[PDB]
Design an enzyme around this catalytic site. Structure first.
Site, PDB file in Angstrom:
ATOM      1  N   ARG A 210       7.293 -13.520   2.875  1.00 35.92           N
ATOM      2  CA  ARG A 210       6.662 -12.824   1.489  1.00 35.92           C
ATOM      3  C   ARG A 210       5.457 -12.189   1.684  1.00 35.92           C
ATOM      4  O   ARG A 210       5.536 -10.517   0.947  1.00 35.92           O
ATOM      5  CB  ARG A 210       7.378 -13.263  -0.160  1.00 35.92           C
ATOM      6  CG  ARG A 210       7.500 -12.217  -1.224  1.00 35.92           C
ATOM      7  CD  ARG A 210       8.152 -13.088  -1.996  1.00 35.92           C
ATOM      8  NE  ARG A 210       7.093 -14.043  -2.701  1.00 35.92           N
ATOM      9  CZ  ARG A 210       7.249 -14.782  -3.657  1.00 35.92           C
ATOM     10  NH1 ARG A 210       8.184 -14.166  -4.378  1.00 35.92           N
ATOM     11  NH2 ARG A 210       5.939 -15.451  -4.399  1.00 35.92           N
TER      12      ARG A 210
ATOM     13  N   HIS B  91     -11.397   5.233  -2.408  1.00 33.68           N
ATOM     14  CA  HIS B  91     -10.214   4.982  -2.802  1.00 33.68           C
ATOM     15  C   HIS B  91      -9.621   5.015  -1.886  1.00 33.68           C
ATOM     16  O   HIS B  91      -8.568   4.153  -1.590  1.00 33.68           O
ATOM     17  CB  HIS B  91     -10.278   6.019  -3.278  1.00 33.68           C
ATOM     18  CG  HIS B  91     -10.393   6.032  -5.254  1.00 33.68           C
ATOM     19  ND1 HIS B  91     -10.935   6.140  -5.742  1.00 33.68           N
ATOM     20  CD2 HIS B  91      -9.532   5.323  -6.228  1.00 33.68           C
ATOM     21  CE1 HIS B  91     -11.463   5.917  -7.171  1.00 33.68           C
ATOM     22  NE2 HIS B  91     -10.422   5.828  -7.563  1.00 33.68           N
TER      23      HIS B  91
ATOM     24  N   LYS C 179       4.033  -8.016  -4.523  1.00 31.72           N
ATOM     25  CA  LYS C 179       2.980  -8.766  -5.180  1.00 31.72           C
ATOM     26  C   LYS C 179       1.460  -9.207  -4.601  1.00 31.72           C
ATOM     27  O   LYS C 179       0.774  -9.651  -4.125  1.00 31.72           O
ATOM     28  CB  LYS C 179       3.056 -10.740  -4.405  1.00 31.72           C
ATOM     29  CG  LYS C 179       4.313 -11.194  -5.098  1.00 31.72           C
ATOM     30  CD  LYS C 179       5.360 -12.516  -5.483  1.00 31.72           C
ATOM     31  CE  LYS C 179       3.728 -13.574  -6.379  1.00 31.72           C
ATOM     32  NZ  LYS C 179       4.428 -14.329  -7.170  1.00 31.72           N
TER      33      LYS C 179
END
Ligand SMILES: *Cc1c(COP(=O)(O)O)cnc(C)c1O
Ligand SMILES: *Cc1c(COP(=O)(O)O)cnc(C)c1O
Lengths: 280, 282
Positions: free
Chosen positions: B50, B100, B145
């Protein structure tokens, strides 16, 4: 150079960020960017006011008053001998063992600030830039200038890859703001821009541009427009502390009007220019 | 103790994080939490799978293989002499002058990992906890996540201030997940939970709990339920690496059924128990 670390001005190499700084594990903090022109800080009070409002919104209590904070920024500029460029500063909730909820109100917030010499984007102000439409997938509290910037990072890269300068974001086709700027549209001498609610950052440049329009008697309507309506505008430009008033002459291969910087954008640029410091 | 810093296990004091680390400036990174029981790591491979999936979703390239990362966590557990607790680890895009857009592909990602001794939540697992409903205002890629956790932070604080353990989030009155857990609801002996799409993180304990349901022949239906339906459930519980299966017996001062832990929750907890790392005779 020298970096502001809390209330001290230390040499860059001296600063060390803790692995449990909440700004590093949760993006738990807020920031500002202040432009400096020939050694003078532009709209510094407004940016400081905004830093404190952002912190207050996520309940971060800054330990210094505004007068002290202002004082430190001036020292920072002076020690680094900054001519034209910008000051970047942020405040995080502090260092504490990893836990989502707020720490015991004893933890001190960490303040980092540093400068960078950077010239005005003169070529862009004159010629204009290319932009692209990117869906706004950000959170619902865009009014807080926080360190949670992954949405803006992914948008800026999508634009950067297409050779575009900025990504104009939209919630279900309604234009909000850019990844690091506010978006303005002009149609028949009337200025349109999304109102300042939770969907956008209440830019300081945006507010200065709106004051410029009031000064030259140009009507301002804070009403949101769609991506479709934007392509039908006479003129379009984005605003930010670093971009100032940058004309957007093309979006996704469709030229805005003729692909030239309109008449009112030039008028706004001229009025804006009367406000920036230009001492001898 | 010792901290994993990139490809090395070093003493805490040697770790130096830079002010322009993208994790510090844009929350540009991903993380995992792995539970350790009496020295053995629980479902480590799934967590590593994950971590790599999350990093890939935001185009971060973890410089080394899954086997190297695993070997490193094992070392980390060994060096810190961790019995029962968890390993926290994160990867950020790297250190680069503020901007950015992604830096040049020559910038190396920053990996930080450390341990914390923490016992199993005994009282919670047995007595159940109180929860509170909080409006989900997070971004639309909750399946990643990432270190952008300010929404979860404001949500957990809200729950904590009202004396609650967890904040149950809802988007458009539809229950999504908790600030750091997944939410399950039980009705007439059927297991309900929000499907794994962009609205929630596909939790490892979530998957383990569903696997446990199949094993005890409990029917599972991954269909979302509203706040109104949740309060009419027979049983309700949250899942997470550190919470395991924690019963929710009350939401905003409204008892779920009678305020006691339900039979199916208890059964799911017993089946979950058989999956935890343990010896054979000790
Ligand atoms: C920083 C930022 C702006 C620019 O505002 P200025 O105050 O004029 O620099 C606009 N929108 C977003 C999302 C920003 O992060
Ligand atoms: C980490 C996290 C979870 C937990 O899932 P695990 O079973 O620990 O893998 C759930 N929801 C959110 C929002 C999380 O960030």
């Amino acid at each position: 150079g020298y970096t502001l670390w809390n209330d001290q001005i230390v040499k860059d190499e001296e600063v060390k960020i803790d692995k449990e700084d909440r700004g590093y594990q949760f993006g738990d903090g807020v920031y500002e960017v202040v432009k400096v022109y020939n050694g003078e800080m532009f709209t510094v009070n407004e940016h400081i006011d905004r830093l404190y409002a952002s912190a207050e919104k996520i309940r971060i209590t800054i330990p210094y008053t505004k007068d002290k904070f202002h004082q430190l920024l001036h020292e920072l500029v002076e020690k680094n001998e900054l001519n034209t460029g910008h000051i970047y500063f942020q405040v995080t909730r502090g260092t504490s063992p990893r836990a989502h909820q707020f720490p015991e109100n004893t933890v001190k917030p960490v303040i980092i600030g540093y400068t960078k010499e950077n010239p005005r984007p003169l070529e862009n102000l004159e010629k204009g830039v290319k932009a692209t439409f990117v869906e706004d997938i950000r959170w619902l509290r865009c009014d807080i200038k926080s360190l949670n910037l992954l949405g803006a990072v992914l948008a800026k890269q999508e634009a950067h890859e297409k050779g575009c300068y900025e990504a104009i974001l939209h919630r279900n086709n309604t234009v909000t703001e850019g990844s690091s700027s506010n978006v303005f549209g002009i149609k028949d001498g009337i200025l349109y821009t999304h109102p300042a609610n939770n969907m956008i950052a209440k830019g300081i440049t945006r507010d200065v541009v709106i004051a410029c329009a009031n000064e030259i008697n140009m009507p301002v309507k804070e009403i949101p427009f769609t991506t479709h309506e934007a392509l039908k505008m006479d003129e379009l430009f984005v605003t930010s502390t670093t971009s100032e008033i940058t004309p957007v002459i093309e979006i996704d291969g469709k030229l805005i009007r003729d692909g030239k910087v309109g008449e009112w954008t030039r008028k706004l640029q001229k009025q804006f220019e009367t406000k920036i410091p230009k001492p001898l």
